[PDB]
Design a protein around this ligand. Structure first.
Ligand SMILES: Cc1cc2nc3c(=O)[nH]c(=O)nc-3n(C[C@H](O)[C@H](O)[C@H](O)COP(=O)(O)O)c2cc1C
Ligand SMILES: O=[N+]([O-])/C=C/c1cccc(O)c1
Ligand SMILES: O=[N+]([O-])/C=C/c1cccc(O)c1
Length: 363
């Protein structure tokens, strides 16, 4: 039998189905101020039939910014704009989580406070690109700036920034928060030995590498409730030039066992980037499942059939779709009815306006 269209308790909220909208950066916010817009509100409202919407990555602070057009959740104006957006999703009987990030070294000095180098675990360039805007407001890809290593005494401020952003998210009407601990952003920069060469209590051993993310988890659980907190990890493979080191499986299971102790709402595993790669072994999925007692969300080039298979095997609880959610506001109905999926238009994934954003039709 099909399980994708059955309900699921996700911490404090109940999803009516297991077809989730993955977090999707679309870079359409207002500058100055990194402000969400009514257009963004319309886009999310169109997708409110999702079992859970997980928002685009959203800054915890101005320092957190790495992309021109990505929204924040640190200023009064951002809070006010997000309130309207969550109200719109709720008017359509949806549920929405905010994905909260600090981009760390995947950033550029031109968009940092004071024009300064972005921060990271260590002073190592990401060796990739980020997205800025040109003089006409269009998205452009630009090489990342070499970061400054955070001083030990700056770490509590980073934890506080996540805490504060969660207070703001609760006020803004989000149902859950998802900590962005994946894809080579700040939390992952600390987790990975490839990006973390620190020799203090925040580098070296896996305990030390996971210290920041677990301090963040504890701070946000205390601010709100554990049943309001999710986390996204990409702990197996390489993402955006950040690998997971020479003991990736053991290190992942350590982190997951620690997360389980906090009783958080969910663990969201980004299994691959768009270029693909090694599938998770069944054995690894089993080791994760026996250690974590919240919801597990699988993501990365899934099909409905793969989701059904893994849900049926008792290994995951839900699936997050990314690109299919860009193109199909009613993806739930389409998967339920076995309807075709709208053609994707990748040229309009990042930046611009309504075209390629709010103009994909329902059935
Ligand atoms: C345009 C675009 C933006 C994305 N933005 C985010 C993001 O903000 N946060 C995140 O964790 N992953 C982000 N991702 C990754 C997706 O959540 C997802 O893992 C990826 O698209 C693979 O899943 P899919 O095959 O269902 O599209 C993004 C992907 C795309 C294509
Ligand atoms: O084209 N992409 O696959 C983008 C992925 C992405 C883009 C922004 C943030 C993040 O965590 C992942
Ligand atoms: O995790 N990622 O590899 C993200 C990549 C990305 C993120 C934002 C814009 C873009 O063109 C690519």
């Amino acid at each position: 039998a099909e399980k994708l269209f059955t309900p699921l308790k996700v911490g404090a909220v109940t999803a009516p189905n297991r077809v989730f909208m993955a977090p999707l950066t679309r870079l359409r916010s207002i500058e100055p101020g990194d402000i969400p817009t009514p257009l963004m509100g319309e886009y999310y409202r169109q997708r409110a039939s999702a079992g859970l919407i997980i928002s685009e990555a959203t800054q915890i602070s101005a320092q957190a910014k790495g992309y021109a057009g990505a929204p924040g959740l640190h200023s009064p104006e951002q809070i006010a704009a997000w309130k309207k957006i969550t109200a719109g999703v709720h008017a359509e009987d949806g549920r929405i989580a905010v994905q909260l990030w600090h981009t760390g070294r995947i950033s550029h000095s031109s968009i940092q406070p004071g024009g300064q180098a972005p921060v990271s675990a260590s002073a190592l360039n990401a060796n990739t690109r980020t997205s800025l805007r040109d003089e006409n407001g269009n998205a452009i890809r630009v090489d990342t700036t070499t970061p400054r290593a955070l001083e030990l005494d700056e770490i509590p401020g980073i934890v506080n920034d996540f805490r504060q952003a969660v207070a703001n998210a609760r006020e803004a009407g989000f149902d859950l928060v998802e900590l962005h601990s994946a894809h080579g952003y700040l939390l992952h920069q600390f987790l990975s030995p490839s990006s973390n060469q620190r020799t203090d209590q925040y580098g070296g051993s896996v305990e030390n590498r996971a210290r920041l993310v677990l301090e963040v988890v504890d701070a946000v659980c205390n601010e709100w409730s554990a049943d309001r907190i999710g986390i996204r990890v990409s702990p197996i493979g390489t993402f955006q030039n950040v690998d997971n080191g020479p003991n990736e499986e053991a290190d992942a299971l350590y982190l997951i066992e620690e997360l389980a102790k906090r009783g958080i709402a969910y663990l969201h595993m980004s299994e691959t980037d768009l270029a693909g790669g090694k599938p998770y072994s069944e054995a690894f999925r089993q080791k994760v499942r026996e250690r974590f007692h919240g919801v597990i969300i699988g993501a990365g080039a899934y099909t409905a059939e793969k989701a059904e298979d893994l849900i049926g095997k008792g290994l995951i609880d839900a699936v997050a779709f990314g690109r299919d959610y860009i193109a199909n506001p009613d993806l739930v109905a389409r998967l339920q009815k076995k309807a075709e999926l709208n053609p994707q238009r990748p040229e309009s994934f990042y930046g611009g306006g309504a075209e390629g954003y709010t103009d994909y039709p329902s059935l």
